[PDB]
Protein backbone atom coordinates (compact mmCIF):
# COMPACT_ATOMS: atom_id res chain seq x y z
CA UNK A 1 0.00 0.00 0.00
CA UNK A 2 2.26 2.81 -1.30
CA UNK A 3 -0.26 5.61 -0.74
CA UNK A 4 -0.84 5.31 3.01
CA UNK A 5 2.84 4.60 3.63
CA UNK A 6 3.66 7.97 2.06
CA UNK A 7 0.91 9.58 4.12
CA UNK A 8 2.42 8.09 7.26
CA UNK A 9 5.83 9.49 6.28
CA UNK A 10 4.43 12.93 5.58
CA UNK A 11 2.42 12.76 8.81
CA UNK A 12 5.00 11.33 11.20
CA UNK A 13 7.56 13.68 9.72
CA UNK A 14 5.75 16.85 10.78
CA UNK A 15 3.75 15.33 13.66
CA UNK A 16 6.58 13.23 15.05
CA UNK A 17 4.97 12.55 18.41
CA UNK A 18 1.40 11.82 17.36
CA UNK A 19 1.16 8.40 18.99
CA UNK A 20 2.56 9.83 22.19
CA UNK A 21 0.22 12.80 22.32
CA UNK A 22 -2.65 10.46 21.46
CA UNK A 23 -1.72 8.20 24.36
CA UNK A 24 -1.49 11.14 26.75
CA UNK A 25 -4.99 12.16 25.73
CA UNK A 26 -6.19 8.57 26.24
CA UNK A 27 -4.64 8.17 29.70
CA UNK A 28 -6.17 11.50 30.82
CA UNK A 29 -9.83 10.74 30.03
CA UNK A 30 -10.77 7.20 31.03
CA UNK A 31 -13.88 8.05 33.09
CA UNK A 32 -16.29 7.22 30.29
CA UNK A 33 -14.83 6.35 26.89
CA UNK A 34 -17.05 5.84 23.86
CA UNK A 35 -15.53 3.55 21.22
CA UNK A 36 -16.95 3.71 17.69
CA UNK A 37 -16.11 1.03 15.07
CA UNK A 38 -17.59 -0.73 12.08
CA UNK A 39 -16.89 -0.01 8.43
CA UNK A 40 -19.55 -1.20 5.98
CA UNK A 41 -18.23 -2.61 2.70
CA UNK A 42 -20.00 -2.10 -0.64
CA UNK A 43 -21.94 -3.58 -2.12
CA UNK A 44 -23.06 -5.98 0.65
CA UNK A 45 -22.61 -3.20 3.24
CA UNK A 46 -21.56 -5.72 5.88
CA UNK A 47 -19.14 -4.55 8.55
CA UNK A 48 -15.50 -5.33 7.89
CA UNK A 49 -13.05 -7.42 9.92
CA UNK A 50 -10.64 -4.51 10.60
CA UNK A 51 -11.75 -2.23 13.41
CA UNK A 52 -13.71 -4.31 15.98
CA UNK A 53 -10.53 -6.02 17.17
CA UNK A 54 -8.79 -2.71 17.84
CA UNK A 55 -11.97 -1.45 19.42
CA UNK A 56 -11.94 -4.47 21.72
CA UNK A 57 -8.26 -4.21 22.60
CA UNK A 58 -8.75 -0.59 23.63
CA UNK A 59 -11.91 -1.47 25.55
CA UNK A 60 -10.11 -4.11 27.56
CA UNK A 61 -7.37 -1.53 28.21
CA UNK A 62 -9.70 1.21 29.45
CA UNK A 63 -11.14 -1.21 32.00
CA UNK A 64 -7.75 -2.51 33.18
CA UNK A 65 -7.01 1.14 33.90
CA UNK A 66 -10.10 1.66 36.04
CA UNK A 67 -12.24 3.36 33.45
CA UNK A 68 -15.56 2.61 31.80
CA UNK A 69 -16.14 1.98 28.11
CA UNK A 70 -18.99 1.43 25.69
CA UNK A 71 -18.98 0.45 22.06
CA UNK A 72 -21.15 2.06 19.39
CA UNK A 73 -21.26 -0.05 16.22
CA UNK A 74 -23.49 -1.85 13.74
CA UNK A 75 -25.67 -4.95 14.32
CA UNK A 76 -23.21 -7.51 13.01
CA UNK A 77 -20.30 -6.23 15.13
CA UNK A 78 -22.40 -6.30 18.30
CA UNK A 79 -23.27 -9.89 17.45
CA UNK A 80 -19.62 -10.78 16.94
CA UNK A 81 -18.48 -9.00 20.10
CA UNK A 82 -21.10 -10.66 22.38
CA UNK A 83 -18.80 -13.57 23.43
CA UNK A 84 -16.47 -10.91 24.87
CA UNK A 85 -19.23 -9.35 26.97
CA UNK A 86 -18.70 -5.79 25.81
CA UNK A 87 -20.84 -2.93 27.05
CA UNK A 88 -22.87 -1.42 24.19
CA UNK A 89 -23.87 2.24 23.92
CA UNK A 90 -27.61 2.81 24.13
CA UNK A 91 -28.61 6.09 22.41
CA UNK A 92 -25.32 7.96 23.04
CA UNK A 93 -24.81 11.67 23.60
CA UNK A 94 -21.48 13.57 23.28
CA UNK A 95 -21.90 15.21 26.70
CA UNK A 96 -22.16 11.82 28.40
CA UNK A 97 -18.55 11.08 27.52
CA UNK A 98 -15.03 11.67 28.76
CA UNK A 99 -13.41 10.67 25.47
CA UNK A 100 -14.60 9.38 22.11
CA UNK A 101 -12.26 7.12 20.11
CA UNK A 102 -12.76 5.79 16.60
CA UNK A 103 -11.23 2.66 15.15
CA UNK A 104 -11.85 2.25 11.40
CA UNK A 105 -15.24 3.97 10.96
CA UNK A 106 -16.39 5.62 7.70
CA UNK A 107 -15.77 9.33 7.73
CA UNK A 108 -17.90 11.82 5.83
CA UNK A 109 -16.33 13.14 2.57
CA UNK A 110 -16.21 16.64 1.05
CA UNK A 111 -19.29 15.42 -0.83
CA UNK A 112 -21.11 14.86 2.38
CA UNK A 113 -21.27 11.26 1.15
CA UNK A 114 -19.37 8.14 2.28
CA UNK A 115 -16.98 6.09 0.18
CA UNK A 116 -15.10 2.78 0.16
CA UNK A 117 -11.40 2.62 -0.71
CA UNK A 118 -12.56 1.60 -4.20
CA UNK A 119 -14.76 4.71 -4.29
CA UNK A 120 -18.08 2.86 -3.96
CA UNK A 121 -20.58 4.99 -2.06
CA UNK A 122 -21.25 3.43 1.35
CA UNK A 123 -25.02 3.44 1.90
CA UNK A 124 -25.91 2.83 5.54
CA UNK A 125 -26.67 4.93 8.62
CA UNK A 126 -23.50 6.74 9.66
CA UNK A 127 -21.82 6.65 13.09
CA UNK A 128 -20.16 9.84 11.95
CA UNK A 129 -22.01 12.74 13.57
CA UNK A 130 -21.20 12.20 17.22
CA UNK A 131 -17.59 13.10 16.44
CA UNK A 132 -18.61 16.35 14.73
CA UNK A 133 -20.62 17.33 17.81
CA UNK A 134 -17.89 16.14 20.17
CA UNK A 135 -15.58 18.46 18.24
CA UNK A 136 -17.85 21.47 18.65
CA UNK A 137 -18.23 20.63 22.34
CA UNK A 138 -14.47 20.38 22.65
CA UNK A 139 -14.69 16.81 23.93
CA UNK A 140 -11.42 14.79 23.57
CA UNK A 141 -11.38 12.76 20.36
CA UNK A 142 -9.01 10.13 18.92
CA UNK A 143 -9.31 8.59 15.48
CA UNK A 144 -7.41 5.64 14.01
CA UNK A 145 -7.28 4.95 10.30
CA UNK A 146 -5.25 3.43 7.49
CA UNK A 147 -6.72 4.62 4.17
CA UNK A 148 -7.76 8.28 4.30
CA UNK A 149 -11.57 7.88 4.25
CA UNK A 150 -12.05 7.21 7.94
CA UNK A 151 -13.13 9.37 10.86
CA UNK A 152 -10.24 11.63 11.80
CA UNK A 153 -8.32 11.71 8.53
CA UNK A 154 -9.90 15.11 8.04
CA UNK A 155 -6.84 16.39 9.86
CA UNK A 156 -4.60 15.49 6.89
CA UNK A 157 -6.93 15.56 3.91
CA UNK A 158 -4.15 17.17 1.87
CA UNK A 159 -1.80 14.22 2.34
CA UNK A 160 -4.63 11.85 1.46
CA UNK A 161 -5.67 13.68 -1.70
CA UNK A 162 -1.99 13.94 -2.57
CA UNK A 163 -1.06 10.25 -2.37
CA UNK A 164 -4.10 8.02 -2.04
CA UNK A 165 -5.84 6.77 -5.18
CA UNK A 166 -9.31 8.31 -5.47
CA UNK A 167 -8.20 10.78 -2.80
CA UNK A 168 -10.27 13.82 -3.83
CA UNK A 169 -13.53 11.89 -3.80
CA UNK A 170 -12.81 9.46 -0.99
CA UNK A 171 -10.83 11.45 1.65
CA UNK A 172 -12.82 12.19 4.78
CA UNK A 173 -13.36 15.74 6.01
CA UNK A 174 -14.04 14.66 9.60
CA UNK A 175 -11.41 15.80 12.09
CA UNK A 176 -10.30 14.42 15.41
CA UNK A 177 -8.08 15.95 18.11
CA UNK A 178 -5.43 13.27 17.75
CA UNK A 179 -4.92 10.82 14.95
CA UNK A 180 -3.22 7.49 14.55
CA UNK A 181 -2.36 6.38 11.03
CA UNK A 182 -1.39 2.75 10.34
CA UNK A 183 -1.01 0.07 7.71
CA UNK A 184 -3.96 -1.74 9.36
CA UNK A 185 -6.19 0.12 11.84
CA UNK A 186 -6.28 -2.65 14.46
CA UNK A 187 -2.45 -2.33 14.60
CA UNK A 188 -2.70 1.37 15.23
CA UNK A 189 -5.18 0.54 17.96
CA UNK A 190 -2.74 -2.00 19.42
CA UNK A 191 -0.08 0.71 19.23
CA UNK A 192 -2.16 3.00 21.43
CA UNK A 193 -2.61 0.22 23.98
CA UNK A 194 1.10 -0.63 23.69
CA UNK A 195 2.23 2.94 24.19
CA UNK A 196 -0.25 3.40 27.04
CA UNK A 197 1.11 0.25 28.67
CA UNK A 198 4.64 1.61 28.61
CA UNK A 199 3.56 4.92 30.07
CA UNK A 200 1.74 3.07 32.84
CA UNK A 201 4.26 0.33 33.65
CA UNK A 202 1.98 -2.65 32.90
CA UNK A 203 1.63 -4.64 29.69
CA UNK A 204 -2.04 -4.04 28.85
CA UNK A 205 -1.85 -6.38 25.80
CA UNK A 206 -0.55 -9.32 27.86
CA UNK A 207 -3.15 -11.94 27.08
CA UNK A 208 -4.25 -10.71 23.69
CA UNK A 209 -5.06 -13.67 21.45
CA UNK A 210 -5.10 -12.14 17.97
CA UNK A 211 -5.99 -15.38 16.23
CA UNK A 212 -8.77 -16.18 18.66
CA UNK A 213 -10.38 -12.76 18.14
CA UNK A 214 -10.26 -12.68 14.37
CA UNK A 215 -11.45 -16.24 13.89
CA UNK A 216 -14.21 -15.44 16.39
CA UNK A 217 -15.63 -12.28 14.81
CA UNK A 218 -15.12 -13.85 11.39
CA UNK A 219 -17.37 -16.80 12.28
CA UNK A 220 -20.06 -14.35 13.40
CA UNK A 221 -20.18 -12.96 9.89
CA UNK A 222 -17.69 -10.09 9.78
CA UNK A 223 -16.00 -10.18 6.38
CA UNK A 224 -12.53 -9.35 5.06
CA UNK A 225 -12.49 -5.93 3.42
CA UNK A 226 -10.35 -6.92 0.46
CA UNK A 227 -11.54 -10.41 -0.51
CA UNK A 228 -15.00 -9.37 0.63
CA UNK A 229 -15.35 -12.93 1.83
CA UNK A 230 -15.57 -14.86 5.11
CA UNK A 231 -11.85 -15.51 5.62
CA UNK A 232 -10.11 -15.46 9.00
CA UNK A 233 -8.06 -12.49 7.88
CA UNK A 234 -7.85 -8.69 7.94
CA UNK A 235 -7.43 -6.25 5.05
CA UNK A 236 -6.43 -9.17 2.85
CA UNK A 237 -3.56 -10.11 5.17
CA UNK A 238 -3.38 -13.48 6.91
CA UNK A 239 -3.23 -14.07 10.66
CA UNK A 240 0.45 -15.05 10.55
CA UNK A 241 1.50 -11.43 9.97
CA UNK A 242 -1.11 -9.93 12.31
CA UNK A 243 0.17 -12.28 15.00
CA UNK A 244 3.73 -11.26 14.21
CA UNK A 245 2.92 -7.61 14.81
CA UNK A 246 0.98 -8.16 18.04
CA UNK A 247 3.83 -10.32 19.32
CA UNK A 248 6.31 -7.56 18.45
CA UNK A 249 4.28 -4.89 20.22
CA UNK A 250 4.00 -7.04 23.35
CA UNK A 251 7.77 -7.43 23.15
CA UNK A 252 8.52 -3.74 22.77
CA UNK A 253 6.29 -3.15 25.82
CA UNK A 254 8.04 -5.68 28.09
CA UNK A 255 11.39 -4.27 26.92
CA UNK A 256 10.44 -0.83 28.22
CA UNK A 257 8.62 -1.83 31.41
CA UNK A 258 10.98 -4.44 32.91
ZN1 LIG B 1 3.98 13.67 0.26
ZN1 LIG C 1 -27.97 12.77 28.70
ZN1 LIG D 1 -8.89 2.28 -7.83
ZN1 LIG E 1 -9.44 2.01 6.38
ZN1 LIG F 1 -8.10 -1.44 7.24
ZN1 LIG G 1 5.54 10.13 28.16
ZN1 LIG H 1 -10.42 -3.02 5.27
Numbering used by the authors: 12 to 269
Give excerpts from the publication.
Here, it is reported that multiple zinc ions can easily be charged onto the surface of proteins with no intrinsic zinc-binding site by using zinc-containing solutions. Here, we show that the surface of proteins can be charged with zinc ions and that the anomalous signals from these zinc ions can be used for structure determination of proteins. In conclusion, we demonstrated that protein crystals grown in the presence of zinc ions or soaked in a zinc-containing solution are easily charged with multiple zinc ions on the protein surface and that they are suitable for zinc SAD/MAD phasing. Considering the high phasing effectiveness and multiple zinc-binding sites, we believe that zinc derivatization of the protein surface is a largely unnoticed but promising method for phase determination of protein crystals.
Recently, we obtained crystals of TON_0340 in a precipitant solution containing zinc acetate. The TON_0340 crystals, which contained six molecules per asymmetric unit, belonged to the tetragonal space group P43212, with unit-cell parameters a = b = 107.44, c = 355.03 Å. Additionally, three zinc ions bound to a cluster of six acidic residues were located in a putative active-site cleft.
